[PDB]
Amino acid sequence: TTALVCDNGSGLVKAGFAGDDAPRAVFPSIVGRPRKDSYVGDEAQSKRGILTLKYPIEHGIITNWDDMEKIWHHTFYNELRVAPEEHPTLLTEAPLNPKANREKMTQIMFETFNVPAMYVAIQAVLSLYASGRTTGIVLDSGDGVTHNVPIYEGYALPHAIMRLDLAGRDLTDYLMKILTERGYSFVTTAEREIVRDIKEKLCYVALDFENEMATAASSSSLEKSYELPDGQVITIGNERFRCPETLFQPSFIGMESAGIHETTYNSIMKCDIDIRKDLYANNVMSGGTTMYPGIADRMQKEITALAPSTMKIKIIAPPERKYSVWIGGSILASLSTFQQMWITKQEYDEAGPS
Amino acid sequence: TDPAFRSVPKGTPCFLIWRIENFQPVPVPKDQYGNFFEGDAYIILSQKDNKGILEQNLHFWLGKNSSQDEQGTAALKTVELDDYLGGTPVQHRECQNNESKLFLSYFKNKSLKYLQGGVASGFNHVEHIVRRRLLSVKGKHTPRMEEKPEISWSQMNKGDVFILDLGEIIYVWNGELCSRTERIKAMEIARGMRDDRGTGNIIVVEDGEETPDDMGEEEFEVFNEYLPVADKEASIKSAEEGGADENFEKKKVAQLKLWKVAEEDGNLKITEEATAPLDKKMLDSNDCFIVDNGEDGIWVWTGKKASPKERKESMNNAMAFLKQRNYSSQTRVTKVPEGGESSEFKSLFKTW
Ligand SMILES: Nc1ncnc2c1ncn2[C@@H]1O[C@H](COP(=O)(O)OP(=O)(O)OP(=O)(O)O)[C@@H](O)[C@H]1O
Ligand SMILES: [Ca+2]
Ligand SMILES: [Ca+2]
Ligand SMILES: [Ca+2]
Ligand SMILES: [Ca+2]
Ligand SMILES: [Ca+2]
């Protein structure tokens, strides 16, 4: 039997089969109900006008259990097209997910889809394994949440975990705003998807923000073109690096939190002194919001200025890191000990969700 | 517990080396210690009894060409072996040409050698290949769809409607002598495909109106890249050369046949349940059913309450049909879970 790996993200669902090197289903974590009682994923976005669209997962924590049922139903029966009662299923959970939340995932998975067995793994931990590591600090940034998870010998240190409510959906909103100030028109949710595409294709992180800001202010050498679905071409200037700069300067979006370089530093400082050298040398980045060109060299620069000079700072940016969590779960569910660590339907029916 | 870790002495000194092979730590022969393949990942456990205490060092060595699944398995298994021995071992990550002195101390006499190659990755490469196919919609009463063995004009005619399926972009090509029922049924087949995949734009193309003006500059490029307009007249067949719409539909209704795979008293039986018009209520959730559309697709409907022997033998006999009838490579067997029936599967049922 081959197992299923479903990485329930805040904005995207990454699902597939254990043993594969990449997910076969990447669709938005969207449920659309009309103003065919439900629409999930891309079809819900292709029919925005008829429906109201809601996020079942908020900041990594799943909040609408009824609409999330439709996500998992669409995942099994529409995307993968598999009988869930035939496949063990590995799910992912956000760092510091409440226990009662993990219990309700198990309940739905067993007495709604009748899976034979299941297991829940932490998203940041799976990314570290995917990079071939058991010790390190993971920076996981997606659509709704950004975390700093220091992990030592295969287990996260929960006392030093940082949570930043600044992520990709906030960055997409910021790009809509500054492009509207420029003179363009992007306010609707349908235009949110246009700007999200602009963000993923033309944005990057400047190694020196004020110098890059001075470059774009004196010439047009940094300006790029973007073709709208209409065919109109628009010009993107300093907005290309002002949008990702919010990660390092949260005050751009109106947030007095520390930057992702400081939260990474503050997380390491909350761990024992005799493991920080390994934590500095193993900064593993994960998620789509970490896919900006130049974010690795900027993180390398900003952390080197905060850390002691005798410490070696190393940032690891795997090429396929927007799927690190899923790839990490694919290896775990392919190990012949996934059978030993999972909970079977009979054990759950007997003992319970505990 | 992994059966390759059970023989690890939990109190006495030892020195063991495992090699990751297809998601599994395979123990290395003792005399081969030090021979490391660059394409593989290893796990090295050293236990010495230094002055009455057991110092346990747990290293996983990563070759410079090791695959991602082997590096993750080595990391995952190192934690598993760490917790099995109480958690007291100390984990070290060792990369090729950058190993620690403690790791190299184990092999000073044994001679450390880096070897080329290694065992194949256990990953299955997902290529994300889009299924591009030329579909044919022909019929009078209710047009039936057929996948052509190629994408060209020599596979088409001027009397039917054809669907150029390209995944995200779908072309519906109307022949100038095509029926009115073929024009609407092709849209249902196409709109059902777009709703099954959740996205996609459908383009309606008329015969002779394939001009970048009344079609689209970028729309024409994709159409011409797969269906060149210049090779049309020599290759496209006449509406008369295409057979009778009635004879085509009669052929497709006859090839439909519904099999039933049920357990009964523990002895599995595969009877012929029905033919002709097929209805949704024929499919019972307590059993498995094989929908035989012949060379145009074998569909295994799997009910929720079906037995494991029903599910296994239903796929086996559906696969057996393909090899026995020596169908072409394009004839596929598709497991259809109850509640995950696609529009193409429902098209085989007249009432639903
Ligand atoms: N090339 C890119 N450049 C910048 N951002 C990108 C790129 N590709 C994807 N993203 C962003 O990554 C986000 C989704 O990534 P991911 O699937 O890791 O997040 P998620 O798991 O849905 O969210 P969370 O991590 O909060 O659960 C989207 O907001 C998208 O805008
Ligand atoms: Ca995530
Ligand atoms: Ca190998
Ligand atoms: Ca340990
Ligand atoms: Ca016809
Ligand atoms: Ca039965």
Author numbering:
A (entry chain B): 5 to 39, 50 to 368
B (entry chain A): 2 to 353
Quoted passage from the original study:
Villin is an actin filament nucleating, severing, capping and bundling protein; however, the structural basis for villin’s functions and the characteristics of the actin polymerization nucleus remain poorly understood. Villin is a member of the calcium-regulated gelsolin family of actin filament severing and capping proteins, a class of proteins found in Asgard archaea and nearly all eukaryotes. Eukaryotic G domains are often associated with a ~65-residue C-terminal α-helical headpiece (HP) domain, indicating that this architecture was likely present in the last eukaryotic common ancestor. In vitro, villin can nucleate actin polymerization and bundle filaments.
Thus, the actin conformations bound to the separated halves of villin have relaxed toward the twisted G-actin conformation by 8.7° and 2.2° relative to VA3 complex subunits A3 and A2, respectively.
